[PDB]
Amino acid sequence: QKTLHIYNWTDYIAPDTVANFEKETGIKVVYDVFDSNEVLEGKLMAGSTGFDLVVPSAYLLERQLTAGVFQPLDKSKLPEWKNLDPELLKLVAKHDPDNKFAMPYMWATTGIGYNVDKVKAVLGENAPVDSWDLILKPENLEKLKSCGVSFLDDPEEVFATVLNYLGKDPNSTKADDYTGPATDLLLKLRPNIRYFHSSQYINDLANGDICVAIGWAGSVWQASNRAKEAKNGVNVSFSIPKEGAMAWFDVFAMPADAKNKDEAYQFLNYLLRPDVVAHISDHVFYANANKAATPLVSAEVRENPGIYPPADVRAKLFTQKVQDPKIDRVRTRAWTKVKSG
Ligand SMILES: [Cl-]
C-alpha cells in the first residue's frame, strides 16, 4: 500500500485533483488543510509532522530552512520541472537560493476587493478603485464606513502596504517607520474599519455585507464567483492598485523526515503536468507558476489581469523581505496598538 500525506491551504486545489491522482497512480492520499501560516508554522516548529508535502509561503520557507525542516528536492525525479516559469523561479529563489527546497505552486497579490455598485454609490462613477487612495485616504474610508470596511489581520502585509503607499520602503528595516508614520495613518483609518480578519471578508464580500476589503486576489475572485453562482446581484471585483502591491508565492516543500518520498515526487511531477495545475487555477482563481500550463487555463482566468497581471502591473509589485526579529517584535506591538485604537 503506497500512501502520501499532504498539508495544504484550504480552497487551494481542484475538487478532483486528488481523486484523479489516485486513479492514475494507485497511491492513497491523505489530504489535510490549514487556513493560516501560523497554524502551519506551529506544526513545522514542533517537528514530526507526519506530512510528506506541505505548502508554505516562500517567505515562511525561508525562515525554516536554517532549522533543517525541509529536505532538498531531487529535480531528476521531476522531469517536467522545465515547465515552471523561470522568472517565478527567480523570485522564489530570493527565499530559496537555487530553488533547492521548494516547487512554486501558485502566486497572487494583496490588493483591494470591493463591491462595484456600493463603491460607486458612495464615491461616484469615478471612484478611485485603481488606487490605494480608495481605502487608505481617511476621507474616502469615512464615506465607505457605512457599507463596511475590512482589513486583513496581518501586520506584515498591512504595514508593508501602508509603507509603500506613504513613499517609504515597503520592507523598511527602520522601527520608527512602523511606530511613527505607518501607525499614525492606520490610527486615523481605524474608526472606519469594521474588523480585522483574514477570512471573514470572503463571504462578506460575496453576500454584500462589506463593500471594501484588503484581501488576497484569488480569495476575492472566489467571493466574486460565489456571488455570481448565487445570482444575488452582487458584483465583486479586485484591484491591484497603481501604487503597487505585495506579491507572494506559495510553494510545495518536503519535510526532512518524510517517509513517502517516491510518492511525494510522483505528486509533484503530476502537478507539473500542464493540464493538472491549469485545472486547479480554473477552480481556485489563482495563477499557477507553470508557464506551460498558462494557455490551458480558461480564458476567464488567464485573461484576468488581477490574476495573471501583465508586465506593467508586475513591475509595480514588491515582495516581502524577512526582517530581524527586532522588527518582527515592533510590528506585533504596533499592530496590537492599531487594532485597539
Ligand atoms: Cl511569499
Query: Number of helical segments?
Result: 16
In terms of quaternary structure, the protein is monomer
Query: How many domain modules?
Result: 2
The level of helicity is 40-55%
Cα separation of the termini: 56 Å
Bound molecules: chloride ion
Q: Work out the radius of gyration.
A: 20 Å
The sequence of SSEs as H and E is EHEHEHHEHHHEHHEHEHEEHHEHHEH
Q: By helix and strand content, what is the structural category?
A: alpha/beta
Q: Total strand count, please?
A: 11
Strand fraction: 15-25%
Shape: globular
Major pleated sheet: 8 strands, mixed
InterPro entries: SBP (IPR006059), Sperm_putr-bd (IPR001188)
Keywords: Disulfide bond, Periplasm, Signal, Transport
Family: Belongs to the bacterial solute-binding protein PotD/PotF family.
Main location: periplasm
Top keywords for this entry?
341 residues; Periplasmic binding protein; globular; E.coli; 17% strand; transport protein; alpha/beta; 2 domains; binds chloride ion; 8-stranded mixed beta sheet
Secondary structure: elements and pairs:
Blueprint lengths: L2 E7 L7 H9 L2 E7 L2 H10 L6 E2 L3 H8 L20 H7 L9 E14 H8 L9 H4 L1 H7 L4 E3 L3 H11 L9 H15 L5 E2 L3 H8 L4 E5 H14 L5 E4 L5 E9 L7 H11 L2 H11 L2 E2 L10 H4 L8 H4 L2 E3 L5 H16 L1
Parallel strand pairs: 1-2, 1-3, 5-6, 5-7, 9-11
Antiparallel strand pairs: 4-7, 4-8, 4-9, 4-10
Helix pairs in contact: 9-16, 10-11
The structure holds chloride ion.
